[PDB]
Design a protein around this ligand. Structure first.
Ligand SMILES: O=C(Cn1ccnn1)Nc1ccc(Br)c([N+](=O)[O-])c1
Ligand SMILES: O=C(Cn1ccnn1)Nc1ccc(Br)c([N+](=O)[O-])c1
Lengths: 302, 301
């Protein structure tokens, strides 16, 4: 029993984290096979960061301008190139701790684990969701750039996030490992802001299923609804639309608990309309939207 | 910025997790140097659960009755002893992935990371606190016994918890790595129940200081309180007493934010009286008590 925000075990990724220094900038890199991946903004100084020309700044650098440290050992950089907003530093040694891995791009609503790192040294692991507005509500200080996000699907690590920056509201923006930003963000110091966020409806329903499985049943009711009617309600409360694909994905949880998705949507309808009347659900006074259907099944079964 | 329930990176512990089988019972063990630590209840049968005599069950076992599996490899057990409620199985191979480590027994209010494991394989990592009633609010299914709790406050792993059982209210009880239970619990399936839980006041204050560090001031007020009056009110909401030790420990956070400890105590009094009136603090609509003063300083600054 019990239900906790749970991260994947981080050991396979810990063995890939290194320190990358260029000039006075130090941040984190990901060392897989014979390449170190890190944010391209590592090459910038402050004046550069105002309006950088990355192509031009990069051509001026030699391999030996990049100091890469794995533990106490220096790695030797033998090549450098850019892909989108990530720098790829070819080094002389393949990482012997390289796990089986893939680069994947995730969708808003999907969750992943973040291994927060400073000076190439892992400091903490926590679970995040890619928000509908393409930010993450992480916990990152200066020096954390190049920290990564991942899922583990079997023995295979799927890397999905690399940390680039903090926005002024205190949320976080970054890229996939091919250096494509999530969201309408750029790696330069200009005015940027998170768009208005929405709640991830399918995840809230998943978490309501978790609550039931753990014996928290007070919000269940005799009513059902339809997708169209519920979606009219979701829109009003700044919830993402629920699709038939979402209903399909919750199918397992529906079967296990005897609460159809639209039955559970009637519960959620009522909660949005009336609140919780001083009660809690899984020890929360707010509706939690950072567990996916898969997360709930995995933790309440596997 | 941001503030998250953050666990320690788990890799140093993952490389210590093994599977221990005795008869039909399989659970997890922790392999450090040449010893595997696991709950002694691994040697119990169906009969045994109400009133096991562990000394009598154990004398009947030979080394070869214990199957220890580290990944794909069987380890050979070459000795066994019991210490309190843990079994220590001496094995023929020192663990080459043994980290620098120590065993520490923690006090209520302390936090740690749990690496939940099944069949000797890690499933997930999360943060927990030792509750005032000596339980933890974990996430554990059948087969999770022998999962451990730890901190890593430099490169040294401090093991502080080993999971033994789930109580009827769905909370969790276990031992230190010397096999002494936290709280009044025993490894027997007789009726036992957790004492009433309370809120960890010192941690809530730490978390209020975190909110200020991260730029949130709305819940402060112009008042102060004596320590004794604070405690008198706090106890009426099932909050643990705040001691002078606790006030001392919050000294650094007080100095960083410019808010005296008893001033913050006055804020907490008002929060308990008023609630949050539709606001949140660090993204929570409830007062959080599973971050310690040390945790706040580690994550914030
Ligand atoms: O934001 C950070 C540091 N930090 C603090 C917490 N998490 N990250 N560095 C940074 C700021 C603005 C920008 Br536009 C860029 N950039 O060039 O992409 C980098
Ligand atoms: O509770 C569990 C299984 N589990 C599920 C989640 N967390 N733990 N095993 C167990 C239960 C009661 C007792 Br008294 C004993 N024992 O003899 O120590 C073991």
């Amino acid at each position: 029993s019990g239900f906790r925000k749970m991260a994947f075990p981080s050991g396979k990724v810990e063995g890939c984290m290194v320190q990358v220094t260029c000039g006075t900038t130090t941040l984190n890199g990901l060392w897989l096979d014979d390449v170190v991946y890190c944010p391209r903004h590592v090459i910038c100084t402050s004046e550069d960061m105002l309006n950088p020309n990355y192509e031009d700044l990069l051509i001026r650098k030699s391999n030996h301008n990049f100091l890469v440290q794995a533990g106490n050992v220096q790695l030797r950089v033998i090549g450098h190139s850019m892909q989108n907003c990530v720098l790829k530093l070819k080094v002389d040694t393949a990482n012997p701790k390289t796990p089986k891995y893939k680069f994947v791009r995730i969708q808003p609503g999907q969750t992943f684990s973040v291994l927060a790192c400073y000076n190439g040294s892992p400091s903490g692991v926590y679970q995040c969701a890619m928000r509908p507005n393409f930010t993450i509500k992480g916990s990152f200080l200066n020096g954390s750039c190049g920290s990564v996000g991942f899922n583990i699907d079997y023995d295979c690590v799927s890397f999905c996030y690399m940390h680039h920056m903090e926005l002024p509201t205190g949320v976080h923006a970054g890229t996939d490992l091919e250096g494509n930003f999530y969201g309408p963000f750029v790696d330069r110091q200009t005015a940027q802001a998170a768009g208005t966020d929405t709640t991830i409806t399918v995840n809230v329903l998943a978490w309501l299923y978790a609550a039931v499985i753990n014996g928290d049943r007070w919000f269940l009711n005799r009513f059902t609804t339809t997708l169209n009617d519920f979606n009219l309600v979701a829109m009003k409360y700044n919830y993402e639309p629920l699709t038939q694909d979402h209903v399909d994905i919750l199918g397992p949880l529906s079967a296990q608990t005897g609460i159809a998705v639209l039955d559970m949507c009637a519960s959620l309808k009522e909660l949005l309309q009336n609140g919780m009347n001083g009660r809690t659900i899984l020890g929360s006074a707010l509706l939690e939207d950072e567990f996916t259907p898969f997360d709930v099944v995995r933790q309440c079964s596997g």
